[PDB]
Design a protein around this nucleic acid. Structure first.
Lengths: 231, 229
DNA sequence: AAAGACTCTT
DNA sequence: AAAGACTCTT
């Protein structure tokens, strides 16, 4: 399937590749820095052509956002527009890890807010997650010598709702937080939500601050009880 | 000086993709986070070359989310550190986000590599740029499409280009003047001094509600001082 | 505008 | 944890 093929390609490319730095048209190479801000960018650029190849193979068109719009890549067959696939690349570093899974006050609450296509046209939302362990200009003949700012990159592909957690991933920027677990748990899909509907309902009614949440719910246990009693 | 040399190097120093150890090149994306990341990596070598030529050591933050991108200083003079931050924006009159107003400018030790008081200068290296799903090999360098048509750069003291309107809301950033590249280069700001720049931002209220009863721009701030703050 | 969209630390 | 640190658009 598109998913299995996508997973295998990312898994493969990541085994046989290491990004060294940026290159100028005159062939000078510039090394990478340690800021995850740098790596997120590097992993997004590194993923682009792979997603595109696998997609094209399966008859899917790919569209990128325009600024501030989810998702990184929108896939769909020309014949079935109403059945889009949204893929977003998330990065974190290292042990348990956690990801910020996007805002909970935009498209999940307002169909056309900050999203490339209306939210209801997407049938799937995948997360490609990259996990890396944190660790002069160069010429082409030196690519092997350039030091990298990371080690042991792991990648996984999973449904957003499946790895979504019950605690916010950011305060002021109101992001959904992922489960806090090991990489294996992400691959296996050992989350907390029972369905994508439960995921969407929980995050659609989550209050922005703990003060507001004290009266409603702060975690999945409390949410289910609140549901049991009539909301 | 270190400043004139840095400025000359910057003007002197076209990135077209990321390169793997195995020689495969991946093109640049249009994404905003992309170019700022690119311009910061491009600047590092320049900064380090010039600094070292002047006896300065360069340090980058170890913890993320700590200002500034580059801290320069001579081990002999530790209270004369210089801060350099790279800022990026695009064109198709520009404007920059110049950092937060609720962190280190209000709290000496907050989100900064060294206490605010040890820095005698805060420079901004501003990059302005006018805005392929395949890989390439080293031999095709000349054919890789770039996502920007031109780039301009400048070095200027932070206070000189600072404006009176916030650069962002929820992320409480200082807004720069809203002018042409030329003005930034020359330093055609609004604040009389760095001391006034600092006072305005240390007392700036977060929301328009809190602000309307105090000050929302330079004139209102000057009146607020007359009134006895 | 002014406010709120788009990974990490303490 | 929850809250608040780190360029663009509505």
């Amino acid at each position: 399937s598109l998913r299995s093929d996508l997973i295998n390609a990312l898994y493969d490319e990541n085994q046989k590749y290491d990004v060294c730095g940026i290159i100028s048209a005159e062939g000078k190479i510039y090394p990478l820095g340690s800021d995850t801000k740098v790596l997120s960018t590097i992993f997004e650029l590194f993923s682009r052509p792979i997603i595109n190849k696998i997609a094209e193979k399966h008859g899917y068109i790919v569209e990128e956002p325009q600024q501030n719009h989810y998702p990184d890549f929108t896939l769909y067959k020309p014949s079935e527009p109403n059945k889009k696939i949204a893929i977003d690349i998330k990065t974190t570093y290292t042990e348990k890890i956690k990801f910020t899974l996007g805002g909970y006050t935009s498209f999940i609450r307002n169909n056309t807010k900050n999203i490339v296509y209306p939210f209801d046209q997407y049938i799937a939302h995948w997360i490609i997650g990259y996990v890396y362990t944190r660790v002069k200009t160069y010429n082409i003949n030196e690519l092997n010598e350039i030091p990298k700012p990371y080690k042991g990159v792991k990648v996984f592909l999973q449904d957003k709702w499946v790895i979504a957690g019950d605690l916010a991933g950011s305060g002021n920027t109101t992001n959904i937080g992922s489960i806090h677990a090991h990489y294996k748990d992400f691959v296996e899909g050992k989350g907390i939500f029972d369905s994508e509907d439960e995921f969407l309902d929980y995050w659609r009614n989550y209050e922005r601050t703990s003060q507001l949440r004290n009266d409603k719910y702060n975690n999945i246990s409390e949410y289910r009880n609140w549901i049991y009693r009539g909301r």
